[PDB]
Amino acid sequence: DWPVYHRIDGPIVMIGFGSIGRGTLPLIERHFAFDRSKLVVIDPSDEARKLAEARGVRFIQQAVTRDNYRELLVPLLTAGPGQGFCVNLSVDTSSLDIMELARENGALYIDTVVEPWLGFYFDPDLKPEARSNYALRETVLAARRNKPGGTTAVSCCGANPGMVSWFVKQALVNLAADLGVTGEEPTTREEWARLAMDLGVKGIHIAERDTQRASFPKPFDVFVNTWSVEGFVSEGLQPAELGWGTFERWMPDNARGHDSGCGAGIYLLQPGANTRVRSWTPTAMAQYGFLVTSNESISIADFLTVRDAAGQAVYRPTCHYAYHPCNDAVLSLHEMFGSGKRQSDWRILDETEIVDGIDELGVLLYGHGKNAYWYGSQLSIEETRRIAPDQNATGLQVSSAVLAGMVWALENPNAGIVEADDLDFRRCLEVQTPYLGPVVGVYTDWTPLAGRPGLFPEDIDTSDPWQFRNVLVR
Template sequence: MSYPAISSGKKYVTFFGRIVILGFGSIGQGTLPLILRHIDCDPVKITIVTADERGRAEAEAMGIEFTVQPLTRENYIEILTPLLDAGDFLCNLSVDVSSLALMEFCHRRGVLYLDTCIEPWCGGYTDNALSPSERSNYALRESVLEFRRRTGDEGPTAVVTHGANPGLVSHFVKQALLDIAHDTGVEASPTGRSGWAALADHLNVNVIHIAERDTQVSNLPKQPGEFVNTWSVDGFFSEGSQPAELGWGSHERHFPTDAGRHSFGCGAAIYLNRQGAGTRIRSWTPLEGPYHGFLVTHGESISIADYLTLRKGQNILYRPTVHYAYHPCDDAVLSLHELAGKNWNLQREKRILMDEITEGVDELGVLLMGHAKGIYWYGSVLSIEEARKLAPYQNATSLQVTMPVVAGMIWAMENPNRGLVEPDEMDHARILEITRPYLGKLVGTYGDWTPLQGRNPLFPEDVDMSDPWQFKNFRVA
């Protein structure tokens, strides 16, 4: 397959330090050409450190040093110390390597840092010696926030959880709030956490779904014993094995029967005592319409809910309910069905769909509900054809991740002394400016759908009809 040129594109920033890319699966392979396209840096100063041989030929064709060396608790300092010093950059796209350990390493050495999710050491997601609360994304985020409390608000910038989601969708939320304000005649110039939270409260945004539908299809169907996906199989399996999690809104009246609250931290989220990849949830996107997604845990479900919380002393005045509602490609749904049937023992064979994709789009956006205009979906509708024209080594899903990674790196280079930063705390306009050319159609559309619309006419349910955004006992699907 022929690919577009790497060299053509606007250089947003010049970087003189070294760059280490940790992990080189599908996302790493797609990110590297975009770094070379949009960051003015010396390719000789880029090193890939990864756990296996995937992507070696692609990296070496671009003149990039490629090292196979899995990182562990015992060896990560020894391996990274010769490669990174003050003013350098660690782009962490790995799995099974502790994000917190890497952040602490970078902070000590004055190294800029970015990741796409907060990872524990290998096995941390599925360690049954830990309680559901302890192996949640909530707990991982709280450990990182505690690191920030210890180190302060300055020091080398560490951008955490900045891919498509978590990451890009936090910027979509801010743009969606501004759009709704404009379309309902509300003057809005929010700044800081309290300003954005006050705007969301004023607009009566009770619920935010990260609503994603992937319709990409392949000419090589999934085989028995194979897990097929359009992005990292290991990453999807890990997060799907965690408890389902959601930011818990101040308006909610019916607590889920199998839910738990955390005994520590900000209190913005709850968890369910079941896997996220085994929990279905109703949602809506513009092309697909209503669908059943999976309530997979993601960092943005917690960080957005926390960021948009209004407090008076210890009292919560306002907080939206926030969660992911993910319908992956159909082959991935079949893979999940098989995985659940095997008691969540991951299939031996794994395949990332790339060149074999024949058609389809990834609709990735945020669905804001409860406001005066009903529902508003804002996000990216990117087809496989568009993705292939825009950048090499991409499908529609990966490009929605890789360009936000590069945008986050650029923002960190432009703001190198901000300490630890979550996506919600960054300049959404700057990130959207950089990513917009790679997102296909940026769509904002209103609708009148609710989760109760046309629900189960043949089998009556005990639901609270006074509020279309809630279900008694949280009967999600």
Template sequence: MKHVSFSARLVMVGCGSIGQGVLPLLLRHIDLAPSQITIVNSDERGRAVAESMGVTYLVSPLTRENFREILSPLLGAGDFLLNLSVDVSSVALITFCRELDALYLDTCVEPWAGGYTDTTLSASERSNYGLRESALALRESGNAGPTALITHGANPGLVSHFVKQALLNLAQDTGLVTTVPTTRAEWSALAQTLSVKVIHIAERDTQVADIPKERDEFVNTWSVDGFVGEGCQPAELGWGTHEPAWPADARRHAFGSGAAIYLERPGASTRVRTWTPLEGPFHGFLITHNESISIADYYTVKNGEDVAYRPTVHYAYHPADDAVLSVHELAGKNWQMQSRTRLMMDEIISGTDELGVLLMGHAKGAYWYGSRLTIDEARSLVPYNNATSLQVTAAVLAGVIWAMENPRAGIIEPDGIDHERILEITQPYLGEVVGVYSDWTPLRDRGRLFPEVLDEAEPWAFGNFRVV
């Protein structure tokens, strides 16, 4: 089914696993010809897929010095820049698109190459919090101009829409009579009324391959460069008003909304306890993501200048087992990258990516809502995808369609757009979309081997997660 027609040009920057996986979806659901699409990539990785569909493919690595020269002939007013790259500044591309009056979408706010690990910058400056603030600072008065939908992949992106649907489900199941909120103030008031204290983006990837990880190799089910980059950034989380204790290595930011904090350690070295319905309890990495900040910010309630309510929000990610081994090896080498990388795709033989949001602290305990997509389902739905990439590419497709339908929304985040429209487009590609209640808390079975000092009165507090 074609959701929307688009007569202008679409330029895709980057063509790794997500670029290759989203291309058939764009041609399936948007009325545009392959001749309208140009891919600009830093290497040859996606050429065969692109040219098999009749799409123009250019190898032209973008830098601070050349990106305008390369992109200017390809883009103009009304065209669309789909940024799926790494090591290319999102802020630079957003600024460029606003000058041209072109539409824009990305899946994360990227710095130029080396920005994630540039130790000449403070941890705050190279955090996702800092990158987000730099993108939002481009908003003009009234936030007019062409739509630039930032950070709209699976997470960040799709999970923000899961949060809204989960809140509505909770409201219904707890007997709270409410209409669907239409404003940020109404959504945040609903979360406060429901007493949602903590939101995890809780993900467990169980995909396995028939080729095991080798020594000095980083293996992952989605972009290796993207995962390593964000894993080396400081661990970050939205900081809730209910939190009774302050983590020892936590720091506040001296600028911006104040909705989040960071820890002086890499996210890929920080583990937290979480829960998903299929896996049950597990340790996830506290990887920094834009949604940890944007969701906490969006659901903040203020009395004047004082923050009256804000949930704690963070990612808790257990990637595929071979990716965990890869992270362990990376950390052991003091974050010096392995010499070889491999994206798991055709060699995957089984497994599921269970991605959702876990809302805790409310009257019904814990509620997980999200997608459970198997590798077999993903392969039957769209070529050039695995279970992880399809959750991302479906969300990219939905974001592109929403931007085309709403071309004058200015710079906007997933939390601020229509969740029902996004879920309508993505649901056919998400496998089993479910909501599951649980009585699990981070205190469950703690101290079983050795005694621990825990604050039983605050089972949802971040301090009780005992980051290790």
């Protein structure tokens, strides 16, 4: 039977009951021991309420806001008798503020994104830099510097960001082993960064192809996706953003850096979901991905940075998302950007509405001696239905990563604010792997210069195929 990993000796407050909350609830019920009445879900949606009622769980129909979050969450999280867990799977709420509240009150915390309070992105006074995930992540890093240690709070532990950080570590270990380099895995950040450097990893794509197909044709003026439409659209309209590698010799005119922080990132003055990059996955082969911002684009690049004695970064990989979402989402983006406005309506594909497909999600490490190596999950919708209810393949990759992060936090409850790169990757993947379907590593000789130059002149760097100059669709 399914492993029960830990007892939760206090309230479980789930904030948000959308596609991820719905997929995560049954895993929490499955894998943790707790009096069922300890769990309560908070979401303003009527649709969410009706589903919660059907699932028999306590439900509070309320939006968490800057104005009410303390009066609402403090009593719920401290109801006792022991340590509670705030599982934040919402939109429109401040990850940082909720995380800091949980910590102040001794509750564990996890989320899958650094989200700001509602209103954040449509303020007519926020410059593009302030919209970036770099900036948002810096608020979390600052919180950690201000209050080191204390109760564990796991930031950005979904599929991506989240799981993909563990994939990068496993991929680095495999690359070394495949070269016949034996010896202990790295144990410190510095050792991981040096392993990437020593293997000659120039960069990393979070290389995803979602092939889930709907049972109905795409409706006009409806945005369709396999996870949050609101969240995807919001992220898609943020600047394109990437961790910026030391090997890069060119950036677009509209690229910008940051005055402060870890130094690992740049962003482009254009929306990520309307920015294409040339990339590759095992099922897609060569494909376009969208250069949508993601926390791990920065966090992984930062994590794998090697500095000289003077503190200057001398090695860092490029890192960014190369996302090919489901066909209906591709059409939805073309519709949205073509119209200049959000569709009037949206829907998230339910497992009952998906005829077939997988969410192929992995990390593509490139520039090393074997050119490119993709490592990740090929979870199908059919396998998903066999192993976890109320979600599609996209959702299960996320919900199972939340499960893994929750197990890690319960096992390591005094670790302070941590990112996915800080967790024990082997333990997290041991928890998650039952929900990931095939997890495979595949080498390819494909590069962004395959078939180039073609019929027209192009500004390419033929000496270094994986330069962003060659990857970016221009």
